[PDB]
Design a protein around this nucleic acid. Sequence first.
RNA 1: CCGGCCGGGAACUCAAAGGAGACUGCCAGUGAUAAACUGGAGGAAGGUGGGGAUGACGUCAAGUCAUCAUGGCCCUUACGACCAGGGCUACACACGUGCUACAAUGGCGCAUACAAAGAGAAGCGACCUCGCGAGAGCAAGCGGACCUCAUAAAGUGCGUCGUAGUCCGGAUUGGAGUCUGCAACUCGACUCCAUGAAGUCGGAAUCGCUAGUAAUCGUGGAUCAGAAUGCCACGGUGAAUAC
Lengths: 206, 98, 144, 127, 79, 114, 96
Amino acid sequence: GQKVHPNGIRLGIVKPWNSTWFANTKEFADNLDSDFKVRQYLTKELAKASVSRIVIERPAKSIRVTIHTARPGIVIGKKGEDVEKLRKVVADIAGVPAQINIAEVRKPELDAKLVADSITSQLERRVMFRRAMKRAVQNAMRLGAKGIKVEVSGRLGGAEIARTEWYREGRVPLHTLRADIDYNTSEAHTTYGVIGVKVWIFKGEI
Amino acid sequence: RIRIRLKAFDHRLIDQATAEIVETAKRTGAQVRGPIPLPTRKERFTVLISPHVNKDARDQYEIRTHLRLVDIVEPTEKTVDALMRLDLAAGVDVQISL
Amino acid sequence: PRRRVIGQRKILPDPKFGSELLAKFVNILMVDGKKSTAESIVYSALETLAQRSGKSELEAFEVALENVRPTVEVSTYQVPVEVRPVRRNALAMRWIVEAARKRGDKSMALRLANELSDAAENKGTAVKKREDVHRMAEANKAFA
Amino acid sequence: NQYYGTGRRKSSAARVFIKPGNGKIVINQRSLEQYFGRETARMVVRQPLELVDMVEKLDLYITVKGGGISGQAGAIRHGITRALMEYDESLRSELRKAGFVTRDARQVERKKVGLRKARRRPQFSKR
Amino acid sequence: RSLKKGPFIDLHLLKKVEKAVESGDKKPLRTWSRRSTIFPNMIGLTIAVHNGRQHVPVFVTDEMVGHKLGEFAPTRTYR
Amino acid sequence: ARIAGINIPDHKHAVIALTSIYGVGKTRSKAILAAAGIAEDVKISELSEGQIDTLRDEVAKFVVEGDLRREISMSIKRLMDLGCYRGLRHRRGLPVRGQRTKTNARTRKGPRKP
Amino acid sequence: AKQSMKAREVKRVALADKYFAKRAELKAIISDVNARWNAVLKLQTLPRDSSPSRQRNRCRQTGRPHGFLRKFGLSRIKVREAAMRGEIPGLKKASW
RNA sequence: CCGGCCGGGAACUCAAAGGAGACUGCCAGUGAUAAACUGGAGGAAGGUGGGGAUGACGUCAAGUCAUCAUGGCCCUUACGACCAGGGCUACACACGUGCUACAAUGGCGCAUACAAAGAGAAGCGACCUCGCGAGAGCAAGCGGACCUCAUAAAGUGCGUCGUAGUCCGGAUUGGAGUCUGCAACUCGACUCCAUGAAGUCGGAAUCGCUAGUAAUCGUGGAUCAGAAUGCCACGGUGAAUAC
């Protein structure tokens, strides 16, 4: 087990943080756990909506949750009853007056959360993994994407030993720190157990 | 007289915010000293990186809190009216204590 | 030393006599990074050496150290090889200091003042170390 | 008039002020033999002033803080050689040649994880 | 040792000792409370102290008083 | 020099030759020489006889040699006759004050047997 | 880590701020140089889990007792996971 | 009021943001006129300047089902749950890693100088009074370049000790206590008085370190009500040697 998380080593360099509140030591743990609850809830209740990121920020006793998603229409719905329902329950969880926004992730096959969730969904619909991976690499390289690597792992095809079998195309410069590597990871709970899907997407060199 | 002490985790974000509060204040009121920087607090955390034995593999982390101090001298009513409700900062803690 | 041929770092000379030779002698004597203590011992011991022998300071030191410098040093062969000058007086000082730590007098300045005085008429312990090295390289002269 | 040098050495900082005058040295409102001149190597604050001599040449008011004994002393040496812009760049030929204008940038190496100190690795058993 | 202010006994052991000296020393006492400093009124009683598995009877002599109960009930059996 | 018993110390500073008395260390010895009005660094040679029995008169006010040895012995016997933890522990010859006997109980337990 | 233990932890906190910080008053004020009666030393028949020295500070997410970090409120494992994803603001790798 | 103490000054240290800087860039020589190497100047730094982060494809069916998640199996009036007491601290032994030593380059007493990095509200807790001391009482200031922790210690200058198991060493043990905590018996930490082992430089063997390094000296922090000789950091002094 030996590679650094390629989001974490780029946190001040190119990648931003998904939480951008300041807090002193008295409420740092409380704000942090409140963020675990709103991302847990808001991740479970938008499983069909293809959600990429949820960014929390707290401007002066009020949360401001931004849902980067690929299907904004299914998040908002017929006149946005679903949004006001979500800020009602996020205001229930965080205990502050909640705002909520939706940012449309166009080009959803270049986002690693959406790619890993895609391949994970296909693996738990019992399709063969080489199609899922290989289709994901092809259609991601089709639109921009100066590199992509996907990597499934663990008891693939229902075996009794676990393999990995990664694929990559293009250039994925993972030790370069100015590389805009969009990396994310999902787990596929199949009837044989968990299958881990990692995906790195190299977008640009700065 | 009116010290506004700003704290944030991102130095670009805090010097943007304090540049805005400086030009706001000395644009409306008068006699702003300047964004004095006041040492960054580096809090370091050294966690074990493995879920079992393996002490020697550890990951070191830090949170850098940046301060800035402004210290606006003239107590104009225009600068305290115009100084309130105008921040547009998200990760800044201000202290506007007189 | 596998690849890297090296330079060497320059030591500051002695603050009383300007002698880098004696500065390396207080570094050979120093233990636990305590240099003040070691230079106190060297100033006291060489001061009583200059008072006893009546010559001067560092020519009494240079004579007492001139009597302990090795000439040459040593299948398993023990070949004799010619000592470089920096290594020559480095070994001289290491043997003086080590033999002075072996002695049974009161203070370190007396152990080392008596060891340098015993090396001035070359009858001490460091001269027995030099004669021992020279018996090893003299017995095994047959390898060059 | 008044001639300045910044002069730092392993966590020290020696402000060195020079006026022309006698051969006195005033360090933190204290003489040289009373600041650290009861201790090891007060010669090194006097080494820049033996390249051309200080006999009755210049009074220097110096103010050092941070560091230890030797750190402060090396800081004053670097401070005086930075403060010998009193005479022109003449001195800084020979003063360069003694190795005095070099900021000695040896600092204490940090302690690293799994090592007791900066490089002393803890001892390892059988094999 | 401990405690500039008061010694320690449990209140249930206080009440069992008061009733034990009032109505006479009839039976050994089930005490789990090893935390408890022997008082001078407890002299002559047989207080069984729990050692993890067994209540072992402790007859209180006069010189038990500056001591905890559990000193007289060893917990580990070494042979 | 025969103070507090058969103890005869001599040719040594008075703060330190008094430490030969079983039951006076450095503190109690400073207390004896301060209470008897004696300088701390005089020897017993170069010290008068009236001065010596002022030291006897001062050392008599603390529990020393015989009374202290039988007081200590009495304390240990009380513990071992109680059969408390400190007495069973004191009796078997194993460390009393809650120390480690898995290894490194070796003053109390003596040099290792097989 | 064993649901029971997390429930046990919530019990101890709830008793800790019911009784004590209100009747821990006793141990701060009456056990003192004032008079005395033995009474308030015996008025520690409070349910023993009102004592705040019986909270463990488990991880907020997994209830792990060891490796806790009071700043973040999490064990070292969830601190690293969340730190790398970017949910802990300001926190990044350190090197000096 | 001799203290940056005040008015004041923004030079300087410094603080933190933004830039400049080091690239074989220049020179000489050697080299396929190539890569480059060796040496020189300038420069704070010279050749990946120092240190860190960064750990390729894979190996060990290496470690973790006890952080978590999880397939299957298994218990489901019990292998689940609540409680008190105990244990994880046991001790003929053996091994690992450390601390303290065996001393005079030192021990002790008196005076006196020079740090860096940190932490702090159910917290850090001055001053002053009491206690030999650990501490106690009243209690300012500080959510903190402002206050507190907090005196750096080795160093230096005097005096003493005088090669003794000693003024070394502090284990062990008795007594008396302080604090935290419902509660120090099993089973804390610290203090005071007393005790004063083993140990005089370590067999075979073995380990770390290439320069602010080893060695040695202190300080801080996390966990934590209280409990470090460990861990993670910080600075002080500061080597030897590399054919």
